[PDB]
Amino acid sequence: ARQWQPDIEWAEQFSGAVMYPSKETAHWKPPPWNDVDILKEK
Amino acid sequence: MMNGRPGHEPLKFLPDEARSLPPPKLNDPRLVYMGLLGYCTGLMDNMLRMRPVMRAGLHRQLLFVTSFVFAGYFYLKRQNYLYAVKDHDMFGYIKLHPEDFPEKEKKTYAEILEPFHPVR
Amino acid sequence: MNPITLAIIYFTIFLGPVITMSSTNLMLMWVGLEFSLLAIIPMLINKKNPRSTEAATKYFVTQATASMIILLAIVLNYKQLGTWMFQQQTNGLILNMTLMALSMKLGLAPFHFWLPEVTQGIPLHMGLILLTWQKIAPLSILIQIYPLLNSTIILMLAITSIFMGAWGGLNQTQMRKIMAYSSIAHMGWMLAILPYNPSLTLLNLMIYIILTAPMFMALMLNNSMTINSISLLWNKTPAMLTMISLMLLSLGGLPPLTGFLPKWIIITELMKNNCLIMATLMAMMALLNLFFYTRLIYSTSLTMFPTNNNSKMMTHQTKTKPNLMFSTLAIMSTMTLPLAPQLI
Amino acid sequence: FYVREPVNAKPNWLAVGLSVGASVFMWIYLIQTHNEDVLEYKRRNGL
Amino acid sequence: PSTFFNLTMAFSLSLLGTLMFRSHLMSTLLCLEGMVLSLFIMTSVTSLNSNSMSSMPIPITILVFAACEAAVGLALLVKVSNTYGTDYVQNLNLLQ
Amino acid sequence: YGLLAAILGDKTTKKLHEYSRVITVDGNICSGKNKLAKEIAQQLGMKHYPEAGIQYSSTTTGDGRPLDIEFSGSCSLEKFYDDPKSNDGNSYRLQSWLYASRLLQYADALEHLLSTGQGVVLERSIYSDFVFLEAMYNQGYIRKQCVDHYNEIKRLTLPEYLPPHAVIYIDVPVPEVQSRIQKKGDPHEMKVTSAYLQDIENAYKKTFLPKMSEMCEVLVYDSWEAEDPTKVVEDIEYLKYNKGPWLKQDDWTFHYLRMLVQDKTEVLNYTTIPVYLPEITIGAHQGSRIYNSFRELPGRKYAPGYNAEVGDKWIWLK
Amino acid sequence: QWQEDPEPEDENVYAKNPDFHGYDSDPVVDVWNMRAVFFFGFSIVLVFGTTFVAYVPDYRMQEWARREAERLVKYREVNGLPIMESNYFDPSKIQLPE
Amino acid sequence: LREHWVHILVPAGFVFGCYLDRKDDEKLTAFRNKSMLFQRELRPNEEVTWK
Amino acid sequence: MLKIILPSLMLLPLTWLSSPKKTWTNVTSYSFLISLTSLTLLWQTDENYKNFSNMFSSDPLSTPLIILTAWLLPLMLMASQNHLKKDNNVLQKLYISMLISLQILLIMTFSATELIMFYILFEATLIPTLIIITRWGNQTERLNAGIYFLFYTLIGSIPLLIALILIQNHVGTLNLMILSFTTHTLDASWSNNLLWLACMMAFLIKMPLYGVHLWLPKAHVEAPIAGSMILAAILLKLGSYGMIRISIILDPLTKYMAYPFILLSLWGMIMTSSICLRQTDLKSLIAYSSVSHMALVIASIMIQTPWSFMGATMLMIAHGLTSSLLFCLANSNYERIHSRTMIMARGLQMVFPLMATWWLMASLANLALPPSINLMGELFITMSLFSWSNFTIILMGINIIITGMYSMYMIITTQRGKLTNHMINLQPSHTRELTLMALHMIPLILLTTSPKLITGLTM
């Protein structure tokens, strides 16, 4: 039909702080977009 | 490399010795390339800034095609010199130290037996 | 920043490399390195986000200890030769220290851990300065002392960097860190030819600067620190999709574009000097760098990733333009190859 | 036309004249340099 | 003479220190300084027994630059125990 | 506007006066805030910004004629009401576009405030948008993640902008508003489940009002105080603009804020963050078409000043 | 599910433009994009090209060599020389090793 | 030309092509009549064997 | 040779500057004439190679190709006017320009004196091709196919880069003319045995050898028709042209360093030919047909006997034209059918009478029917291979029987049998589709009349 443009799922992989997620590395989560961590009330 | 040469001009662009070399013909393909390289820069700019690609900044297009080209003549004028120094330097050494670069004399084929590997 | 402070800092960040380059008394070369360290730290924490303080505190400790090691080399030389500057006679260990130290400030090879992390927590802008106007200084010191440094170590740091940079890059998805990793790699090629033909180091740098400076001002035009973020480039600003494609393939060595020349002449010079062992392995994993470059190509250009409705809103508004430098540095970079002979 | 009228409503007459005028100074210096250059080259060497 | 090898090893013992953190940023910033003292002492020592008075400026330039260097270092340290309530390095692991 | 201008005068410090504040008036779906706003504006000459709309951005940009729905993000408040908990999620897309619209409105307001010096009345603001989403999640309108995506956009963009100086507020119990709805009859607006109106006010009462109380001046008005712009206006002129983050805004600090609002493409930079929740996603094939079509509208195919269709000239020298 | 377009059908361009030649939808571009393609394609490449290629003369000398052989065979046979002597580079020219 | 100037673009390329082509010939002019196989004395009224 | 090239470059300005409606005819009409200027190179009254200038040369081996490279650009632009007619008027002008640059680059690569000029231009052709395959590729897997096409060629390419810089130091210039008239005889060391592999491997990769040919089936499957034509007709033959000009040096080693490849190719010829026998995707079958008929070529550019070489030159030009013809008609079925499956669409002759005649002639070219250059080619490679070892006929004899079977099966299950009941009704044939074919076969008929022109350097 129409050249397959990437769907959401193809896009999903590129999210995450590491492309090829490791055993423990995957446990990590992507960095905050604002570059400012929610951190804590401290 | 070529730095440390006798007479080196410590910070000069093209020493006057480069006067002796022929000037780059303004239409040298290279300078003409730089021109096209430039026109494209101009056109590209218009595009990235979302302007009519060719019909806009006709003043800029000129600044570009004429800045790049200006740069060329004076650069090529130098790079040309640098290369010319390289020969002056290279050829001279071949002589000053002649024994190391001896003019060998090859033998004619009639004498040289070259191996024949039969394809068969 | 009180514009006055901005001036003092920026002047120092700029007087820093310039003193290094101009002076011959090594000491004065060390303080040039010291001023660069002091000037960069304020800018690094401009947002003052929690990530930033981490960045600067790492950058500073890594930079400071290396600075102290470089000074120790100068102090030791002073005793082995009264001169304040490296000479033919210099003890080999004295020079090797300077290589390791300077390879830490430049962040090459087994000391490549700080750069990717500081490149991740600093803004895109200060990222460029931290990557390209802070490499000029240390490299100057090395290029000056090339006749004396060891061919073995440099090569090892060179090859290592190429590998680390490549391998690191493959996994990364954050752009800032993809660039940090590329810089490690290119920095590697540069230091490979230093012992043999310094003049080529200065080409493999300029081209890297003329390639990276457009690439980053591209990343920030849309301020995308994610590939997913750069992938929606097609909606935010469609024209830069064409040149972003060529510049990234240019950063890797593919033949029609300007990026091949640095790798080609470095390989020609190394084969001229007989390192056909080393050069071969470098070129091969250099090919790994293009894989992650093209994976980004895929997401940003060759394939159109899905975007968000709120993007239509950003299209409406006039897009603040990219400075002229982008163009002049995109073209001179993507296609100058037909003019290579003069460049070298 | 434009509610928020374009900042670039019309050319920056200055930006034209320093862009046009600058380029015409470039050429007149460049072409001058070449013929001047040729001469010196010619005479510097025998001819 | 040997005096120099003690100072040099002092700098290496201080080197081993800065390169092996022990959960205290302040202590490190303090080790770092131990080097500058060792460098200052060695530079002054050789300049003094070479009677090279033209170089004494350096022993001090080394200290002046090192002091500010440390000033910057401590301001980063204060910035850290303002964001994390401690100077402990482990906290500095967000950039992973 | 840039450091150059700021360096040479052009300081927001020299352009501020007592009447110069950011005042928002927030109420339920029908609090008569529209009226109070205009008046307060008329009182201090404050530029009265209208509530943010689907096509508020289009009126903002270029010609200003209203855009086609799909060009403006395909959001219907009309469909919001007639089809709550819709399969396509028009309600969330409506809310996300609304947040982007007020982000543009608030930023345009701040740009007028720091440049002209005149104050601004913005009715509802990014600060008072969450009540609609809170009520929508309290209802079946939006699901939990949808909420998280809005909160993430809010946390990323709202902190940068300075808070409303004061937040004039009206209150009229749910019965009142429903009745007020009946007076201006509109099939869609009419069918708004009360509990949803209950959830909107509840948020202001509980969340928005005290939240801002600590941050900005809070003036709550009963309907009766309302419809009496004079009295409310009087009270505003009465409150003391002291408590709040605005106190630290030195000229050299305002400059950077100005340069932000001066750049709309950044104001909403984080509004387009690549978080792929299904309602928000354009989709590449549909998005490409909508783009080729929005970008081909006259005067839009090229930057302002360069598209000849609408009558721009001098393009060959610009 | 995300918003995206419904599959676009492919038009029967032969329903309108019943004279469709396959190049473009509007008819005149169609006609003028075959009147120039059959012409520049067949009429002056397959014809003028084959004419010129056919008339390339003695391509790679193989029209010259069937005569030079004939005079050489004429000359060698009548003078009694071997028609294709068995060594080409004369043995005298060669300086063999020892 | 009502926007048919485009046509000349390609033809023109051929002309400049042949011109630049001649230029190369002019450059590679050594051995004009020194090619052993074709070394001949210029016939009357001919200053170039091949131009 | 700057008329075959400069006028070509100018095509790019014409694709961009020209009207959106008239862009297609200006480009196709002009490159047809660009092919006519290309025909002038064929005028070689003498043996001496025509060295146009320092960097640009054309000898018997390159000339038959430069003309084919110029010829297909018109055709490529005519086969992609349908798909790519649904684009935005700036995606087209990009595709047209991409196709234009391929032959500009390919014309130069085939017409290049310096071997590294070949390398730079050689590996550049990947940029235009990868864009054509990845950007416009219909299937979800073209991102993958593009990766395979870039890495297999690239990993082979960097060894050649090191090798050619290596010979330049060893001999002192990479000029094909000199390298030929100079004494470069490798010395059968262990290292040289590596040099030889370095130079040949990059060429052997894009000329699919049995070991590394997986890139070509994957690439042509999702590639658009214009990309598949370019890969089969000109792109794969870049590898063959390289092997002919590079083995002038490395003269002694290939006598004994070729056995590995020769056996890989001849056994490969049988297995690649056979899997064509049961492959459901038609484009898949043509691609493996291309691998097998190209496996014959690497087995003639390695035996290195005069006849092999021109057998190779005959087959490469001939198979190039035939393969495209097959890939072009496969596309016409794909666009109406909307599926690559061979089993669907049975009986077409009943509904598309002529396309079937083109299908029949293309298949007869595919198998070796005798008054065709395709057969002359195989007959010659077959002869030399027999000379190398009389046993070779067995393996080059199982391939001929298999090649007949799959070539006719494509005709028997696609263009005969009962008509498919009611697939989307199959609209009649456009005149473009038929010409695009006629333009492929009319030259195949004309070349078969005078085979001398495409015979190679050897004869």
Ligand SMILES: Nc1ncnc2c1ncn2[C@@H]1O[C@H](COP(=O)(O)OP(=O)(O)O)[C@@H](O)[C@H]1O
């Ligand atoms: N987040 C939201 N979701 C749905 N509708 C909204 C939202 N924010 C504002 N609106 C719309 O704004 C309108 C305000 O009512 P209206 O009588 O037009 O003005 P006022 O609120 O001043 O009385 C409501 O009808 C409501 O549908």
